[PDB]
């Protein structure tokens, strides 16, 4: 998406989903014996998705007015929003 | 399904059961008050209805239908049950015009038959009905409706059969035309020169309206007290379920977070 965005164009990315990504990252960190944080997730998963979703933005004009637009998806559990992810 | 959701919900339902309990006690107080008015209306009405037992005013051969509920609801199968008796008698004569006394029976009947309704009485179910009010409304019926022109008049009230039971009940009213036409009527000595049937019919209308109001009022408060008792019972049962749900939720939360506390202490050096 950044390739299009730095070519001045406009791209919509749709992740589906971030939840399976979080599960996979938890699996890798636990298998790499990293000490898990809350709900057995790794600590920097907030950092993980923050550096995922801040790569999608609208560029300024001197950058070519490119844009990457983002649609993350979350499956929830019984209509919960209070979970960690 | 958090501890917060179940806790706030259980507290809400405890407040609900407390309010239904207070409402049941207030309903008992108002019911005990309204029984006095019901008996004092009934014993007054029986002095005129024993006459109609003796003076057999039984009519022969357009109809006026009057239903009696209050403005409020919250008394269960009364507003729909009396409307169903209205349905029974109104399927017989669909031309029969309706004068409701009570907002809730008006909303019951206006959805199914907005045609026959031509007068609506409001500001009723706050108090025990007085003869001032009942005689005033009976005056209004011979002022805007002229029910003496109407051949057949039916009054629909609610008879409390017990404190735990009830009945939507019908009362016929015989016009003063029928009163001179009555067979067991010349037995009673009456002055021709005093308009005694044409005023006693009004007096009959006023008394039967007062009896219908003071009887359906007590029936409403009886079924309302019953409904609030059932509400307190159901609320107590649901509190008994959700308290156990709350305890399982709390124990599971503490255990599950202690699992993560241990698991972090598990993968040490």
From Swiss-Prot, chain A:
It is found in: Mitochondrion inner membrane. It comes from the Eukaryota. F-type ATPases have 2 components, CF(1) - the catalytic core - and CF(0) - the membrane proton channel. CF(1) has five subunits: alpha(3), beta(3), gamma(1), delta(1), epsilon(1). CF(0) has three main subunits: a, b and c. Belongs to the ATPase alpha/beta chains family. Mitochondrial membrane ATP synthase (F(1)F(0) ATP synthase or Complex V) produces ATP from ADP in the presence of a proton gradient across the membrane which is generated by electron transport complexes of the respiratory chain. F-type ATPases consist of two structural domains, F(1) - containing the extramembraneous catalytic core, and F(0) - containing the membrane proton channel, linked together by a central stalk and a peripheral stalk. During catalysis, ATP synthesis in the catalytic domain of F(1) is coupled via a rotary mechanism of the central stalk subunits to proton translocation. Present with 41500 molecules/cell in log phase SD medium. This is ATP synthase subunit alpha, mitochondrial. The chain holds residues 291 to 375 of 545 of the full protein.
From Swiss-Prot, chain B:
Mitochondrial membrane ATP synthase (F(1)F(0) ATP synthase or Complex V) produces ATP from ADP in the presence of a proton gradient across the membrane which is generated by electron transport complexes of the respiratory chain. F-type ATPases consist of two structural domains, F(1) - containing the extramembraneous catalytic core, and F(0) - containing the membrane proton channel, linked together by a central stalk and a peripheral stalk. During catalysis, ATP synthesis in the catalytic domain of F(1) is coupled via a rotary mechanism of the central stalk subunits to proton translocation. One of its GO terms (biological process) is proton motive force-driven ATP synthesis. NCBIfam families: ATPsyn_F1gamma. Present with 28100 molecules/cell in log phase SD medium. Changing residue 255 to A: In ATP3-5; dominant suppressor of the slow-growth phenotype of yme1 strains lacking mitochondrial DNA. The keyword Methyltransferase does not apply. This is ATP synthase subunit gamma, mitochondrial.
